[PDB]
């Protein structure tokens, strides 16, 4: 086995894309049983972005504004409401293809699926990850707001991400499903700061087992360290604190491996200190933490769905 | 939006994924109309891998012998072949979902989707790319023989390759679904040679489009230069010559850029004799083979499907 980035199967999530329109704005929406979830930015328009009211852009607004299209079927609205930063339109039908689901708020450093949308109908799929300043490095283009972020556990689909906008950055802000925006971002055109974005230590450290795994070790050395003193080192890079937590976590990854967490610490602090001289790591000259310990197990052990 | 390495949909091809059994052997088949296609080797024991006569095990062998589990739903088999490496169980019931489909021999360089699979179960998805070697390099384990990969166009499904074996090198060998095999590559467990896997000359320069298109542009210089003088140095570097179909391709890309391939050919041959100096493009320390000139304007026009 190599070692990719790799996304959940999409079939359950496309039978459950609809285009939602209103005025000349057309975006993706989420069918879950009678409700089409989306973003509630779908009611401005071009002058109502520097700082619109939504409330009082939804009273101007009735059922029939709302242009649901299932394919080339149109779906009867009969009913609207604003959750946050999220529209749910009751509709007349229930998605016969719903899937078994949850909504889910994943903490930073946690990655998914995003299945890219454009006119209610699925164009790719890749993974990312929550990144610690709550933004997203995606690949969306203009029409993919609506387009969502899910990870497959058992035949449950958990919903955890809807994409909302791109910063100044080109970078990517949304909601969970409740409409709770990841981070401090607002459904506004105005000024807003991503921050410093640090490096996700622990998934660089299921990536460094995943390495071995593969049989891919030159940088494994001779010592060993405590959390205290690479804790010391990770800050200096840029990196987030490692927890105890996390070493219980690398468990399962310790064991398969025979190596020490901490033995591993000392092999990622001496990279952090020499860089890699031009060599590579699972064929990349970068150290990767877009992949979990889970990511690693189901990968590395072959978890289907 | 941003660049990521982007896999198809997978919801037309899960829903033609099956269980082929055979003795203690069970590896996935392709249900299409009423033929499931699979990996001969399926036929084959412990003992009979070194030097095996399909042709002979294959008389051993009854309609009965082979078990097809569609799920939980049992498949009565009425008929099998052997096309060249693959094994056709003609079936009593045609696959409802059957998708529009063609079986196409793609060219080293191309790409294509990979849903890797265990006991007739998606697991995964991602994109990768027939290597010059007629080498993939994905992320399979024990059970994944008869995952396929796949690209869409329009509503059509065109399955490309079905994963057979792992080489010495932790590479992957396969066949079209004609069941010829990508390169020189064998059924047996006999040792065999990829050869010198090249870099994606073209592939390369459609990601230097991609990172300029993003806005990613310091590698750009001053400089122009021939296809024979730039070949004179990719051949060096152990990369794929450059054709004027191969300049051609990336007409599209040059004309959205303002960029003459070949000023990007002198970008290119300055990033080769000079390395990054630890700097990235798309977030990368390395130079990405792994994205067509289609792959780019796709992800960056943004195709739906
Ligand atoms: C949605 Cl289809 C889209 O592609 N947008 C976009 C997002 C949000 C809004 C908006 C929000 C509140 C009130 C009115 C309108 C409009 C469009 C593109 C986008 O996000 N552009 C950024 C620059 C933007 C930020 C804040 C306000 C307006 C626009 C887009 C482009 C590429 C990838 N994703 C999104
Ligand atoms: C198929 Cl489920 C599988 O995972 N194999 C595998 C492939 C082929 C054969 C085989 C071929 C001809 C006759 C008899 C048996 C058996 C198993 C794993 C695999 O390919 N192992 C390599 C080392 C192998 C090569 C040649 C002959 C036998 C074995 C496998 C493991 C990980 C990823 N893909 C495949």
Same mark, same amino acid.
């Given at each position: 086995? $190599?070692?990719?980035?790799?996304?959940?199967?999409?079939?359950?999530?496309?039978?459950?894309?609809?285009?939602?329109?209103?005025?000349?704005?057309?975006?993706?929406?989420?069918?879950?049983?009678?409700?089409?979830?989306?973003?509630?930015?779908?009611?401005?328009?071009?002058?109502?972005?520097?700082? #619109? &009211?939504?409330?009082?852009?939804?009273?101007?607004?009735? &059922?029939?504004?709302?242009?649901?299209?299932?394919?080339?079927? %149109?779906?009867?609205?009969? $009913?609207?409401?604003?959750?946050?930063?999220?529209?749910?339109?009751?509709?007349?039908?229930?998605?016969?293809?719903?899937?078994?689901? /949850?909504?889910?708020?994943?903490?930073?450093?946690?990655?998914?699926?995003?299945?890219?949308?454009?006119?209610?109908?699925?164009?790719?799929?890749? %993974?990312?990850?929550?990144?610690?300043?709550?933004?997203?490095?995606?690949?969306?283009?203009?029409?993919?707001?609506?387009?969502?972020?899910?990870?497959?556990?058992?035949?449950?689909?958990?919903?955890?991400?809807?994409?909302?906008?791109?910063?100044?950055?080109?970078?990517?802000?949304?909601?969970?499903?409740?409409?709770?925006?990841? $981070?401090?971002?607002?459904?506004?055109?105005? +000024?807003?700061?991503?921050?410093?974005?640090?490096?996700?230590?622990? &998934?660089?450290? +299921?990536?460094?087992? +995943?390495?071995?795994?593969?049989?891919?070790?030159?940088?494994?050395?001779?010592?060993?360290?405590?959390?205290?003193?690479? &804790?010391?080192?990770?800050? /200096?890079?840029?990196?987030?604190?490692?927890?105890?937590?996390?070493?219980?976590?690398? $468990? #399962?990854?310790?064991?398969?491996?025979?190596? +020490?967490?901490?033995?591993?610490?000392?092999?990622?602090?001496?990279?952090?200190?020499?860089?890699?001289?031009?060599?590579?790591?699972?064929?990349?000259?970068?150290?990767?933490?877009?992949?979990?310990?889970?990511?690693?197990?189901? %990968?590395?052990?072959?978890?289907?769905?």
């Amino acid at each position: 086995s $190599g070692f990719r980035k790799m996304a959940f199967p999409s079939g359950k999530v496309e039978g459950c894309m609809v285009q939602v329109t209103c005025g000349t704005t057309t975006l993706n929406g989420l069918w879950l049983d009678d409700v089409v979830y989306c973003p509630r930015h779908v009611i401005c328009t071009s002058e109502d972005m520097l700082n #619109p &009211n939504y409330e009082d852009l939804l009273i101007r607004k009735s &059922n029939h504004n709302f242009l649901v299209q299932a394919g080339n079927v %149109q779906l009867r609205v009969i $009913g609207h409401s604003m959750q946050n930063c999220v529209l749910k339109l009751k509709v007349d039908t229930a998605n016969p293809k719903t899937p078994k689901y /949850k909504f889910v708020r994943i903490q930073p450093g946690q990655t998914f699926s995003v299945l890219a949308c454009y006119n209610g109908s699925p164009s790719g799929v890749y %993974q990312c990850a929550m990144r610690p300043n709550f933004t997203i490095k995606g690949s969306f283009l203009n029409g993919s707001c609506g387009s969502v972020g899910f990870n497959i556990d058992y035949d449950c689909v958990s919903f955890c991400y809807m994409h909302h906008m791109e910063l100044p950055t080109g970078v990517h802000a949304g909601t969970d499903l409740e409409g709770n925006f990841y $981070g401090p971002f607002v459904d506004r055109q105005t +000024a807003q700061a991503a921050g410093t974005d640090t490096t996700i230590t622990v &998934n660089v450290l +299921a990536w460094l087992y +995943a390495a071995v795994i593969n049989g891919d070790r030159w940088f494994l050395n001779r010592f060993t360290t405590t959390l205290n003193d690479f &804790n010391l080192v990770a800050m /200096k890079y840029n990196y987030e604190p490692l927890t105890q937590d996390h070493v219980d976590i690398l $468990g #399962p990854l310790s064991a398969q491996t025979g190596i +020490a967490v901490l033995d591993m610490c000392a092999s990622l602090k001496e990279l952090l200190q020499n860089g890699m001289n031009g060599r590579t790591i699972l064929g990349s000259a970068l150290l990767e933490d877009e992949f979990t310990p889970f990511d690693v197990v189901r %990968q590395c052990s072959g978890v289907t769905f």
